Amino acid sequence: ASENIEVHMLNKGAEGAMVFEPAYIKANPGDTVTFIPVDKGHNVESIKDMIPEGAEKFKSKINENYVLTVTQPGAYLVKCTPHYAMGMIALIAVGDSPANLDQIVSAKKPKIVQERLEKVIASA
């Protein structure tokens, strides 16, 4: 059956300011990821060219609880729209050996984002 993973959106966490906790989410097709705005001022949005081919773009409203159903295998880099430049991202890995992970790692993104992404992947 289907699993749900809860993610908190915070002003401050273990990795510093403006964080998703956890920032690495492992899931399977059909699972849900529930994004909880523990602190105000956050949302979640897919990043262009950093979700699998065939997955639908998504953008939640600031300060709303948002439930994402993941269907397409692969890796997804998501941001908090206001805080992307401050490093507020999460990586969702759906299925084994996501085919687009190396592409996401090599994609153009802000330096602080890339540093956090590298730490996330190492914590895998």
Binding residues: 42, 80, 83, 88
88 binds Cu ion, rule: CB under 5 A: yes
Instruction: Provide, for the chain, the percentages of residues in helix, strand and coil under a 3-state DSSP scheme, each rounded to the nearest 5.
Output: 20, 35, 45
89 binds Cu ion, rule: CB under 5 A: no
Using the minimum distance from each CB to Cu ion, give the nearer residue, 50 or 88.
88
List, in sequence order, every residue forming a beta bridge with 6; answer none if it has no partner: 34
Q: Which is nearest to 61 in space by CA: 39, 47, 80? A: 80
Please report where in the chains the tokens 């397409």 appear, as a residue. Answer: 72
Question: How far are the Cα atoms of 24, 39, 64 from residue 8, in angstroms, in the given order?
Answer: 12, 9, 12
Using the minimum distance from each CB to Cu ion, give the nearer residue, 92 or 98.
92
Residue 57 to residue 55: CA distance in whole angstroms? 7
Could you tell me which stretch among 27-35, 54-62, 73-81, 104-112 binds Cu ion (CB under 5 A)? Answer: 73-81
Binding residues for Cu cation: 42, 80, 83, 88
Q: Which residues ranging from 38 to 57 are in contact with Cu ion (CB under 5 A)? A: 42
Nearest approach in angstroms of CB 37 to Cu ion is 9
Which residues contact Cu ion by CB under 5 A?
42, 80, 83, 88
